[PDB]
């Protein structure tokens, strides 16, 4: 008989701008294939409406009326997070596709498709060191992002003998950053990275160009965005980033598996939306498509039917023991213990050169 599969995002609400994508992202899935060893999959959708308290509950429905064997998971963490804990509580599996961190028996249940911070730092601090950066200044959010981004990089550049000369931050919705950026040109570090995403992120690049900087820039794969670049105009030209490979598939070389991957996504993308994409977010929901169809083959296998608790579980063993899946942001390998399954493949550099992402 068929197969159900769960799939929430947020089609209204402050994420929906991430959730549309996500749902394209699941058209070109559905468009590239839409079975499993023979078997046709149901897909069960909901709107979380970007609430967290809505993510839970349409979960619960999910699972406990349409019986289905999985969710792919939504737009904002904090959803992810609550959809989590429902997959926990249900023994149903749920692959995020936000970046959500469970560590620990509490997350066993779920795995976190997008790359940890860390992973993508090390790649830009990676070029800084074939790039004579001696000395890396740091403007950042006063949250939780920035938190994360600074202690990334204290974690990969002191170890490799850069001195971090600067720990400036602002909130997402200041208007300005003069005083920061002035304390951080006066110290004329080699480079200067920003913890930042979206527009705002914009605020300290204008700021070092309008106080005469002529260093390295280097921010993260959150400002890989056409509004975050027309923001930043001059200001952001030769901006150093990490990114997804899938963002520059047609510049990879033929080695990297994942050009392959990525061009089949672009493909099917094109088939059901019309358009080619641009999106790091449909791609994440390409590859949760792409691993549940690993898994689910997998736990077919087994002699466990779809849906029943038994069949749940086989598939969660499945999706957490996932080896070598080349997806398009990584190649996949889980393990029962580890939320996240992304290495060094999972990222290249690019620089923004005349508005476009160039591979480095």
Same mark, same amino acid.
């Given at each position: ?98 970046? =959500? ?69 602002? $909130? ?34 204008? $700021? ?87 898994? =689910? ?16 579980? $086989? ?46």
């Amino acid at each position: 008989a068929d197969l159900k599969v769960g799939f929430i995002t947020s089609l209204s609400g402050p994420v929906s701008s991430l959730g549309i994508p996500y749902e394209k992202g699941m058209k070109a899935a559905i468009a590239y294939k839409s079975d499993v060893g023979g078997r046709k999959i149901q897909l069960v959708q909901l709107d979380d409406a970007s609430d967290p308290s809505t993510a839970a509950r349409n979960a619960r429905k999910m699972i406990d009326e349409d019986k289905v064997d999985v969710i792919i998971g939504t737009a904002g963490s904090p959803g992810a997070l609550a959809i989590a804990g429902v997959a926990r509580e249900t023994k149903t599996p749920l692959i995020s596709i936000a970046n =959500a961190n469970l560590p620990g028996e509490e997350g066993a249940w779920m795995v976190t498709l997008p790359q940890p911070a860390p992973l993508m730092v090390s790649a830009v601090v990676e070029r800084m060191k074939k790039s004579g950066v001696k000395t890396v200044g740091y403007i950042g959010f006063s949250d939780a992002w920035g938190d994360l981004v600074y202690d990334a990089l204290q974690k990969s550049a002191e170890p490799a003998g850069i001195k971090i000369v600067s720990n400036e931050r602002y $909130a997402r919705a200041d208007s300005s950053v003069t005083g920061q950026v002035l304390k951080i040109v006066a110290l004329r570090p080699d480079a200067v990275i920003t913890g930042t995403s979206g527009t705002p992120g914009a605020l300290p690049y204008l $700021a070092l160009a309008e106080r005469g900087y002529k260093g390295q820039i280097y921010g993260m794969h959150a400002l890989i965005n056409p509004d975050f670049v027309r923001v930043g105009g001059a200001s952001v030209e030769g901006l150093l980033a990490p990114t997804g490979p899938v963002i520059v598939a047609e510049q990879l070389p033929s080695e990297n598996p994942i050009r392959k991957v990525s061009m089949d996504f672009r493909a099917a993308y094109q088939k059901a939306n019309g358009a080619p994409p641009t999106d790091a977010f449909s791609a994440y929901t390409f590859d949760a498509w792409l691993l549940y169809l690993d898994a =689910a083959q997998r736990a077919l296998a087994t002699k466990a039917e779809p849906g029943t608790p038994q069949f749940r579980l $086989a598939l969660r063993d499945a999706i957490v023991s996932t080896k070598e899946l080349v997806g398009t942001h990584s190649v996949y390998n889980f393990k029962p213990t580890d939320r996240y399954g992304s290495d060094e493949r999972s990222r290249v550099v690019v620089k923004l050169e005349k508005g476009q992402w160039k591979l480095v």
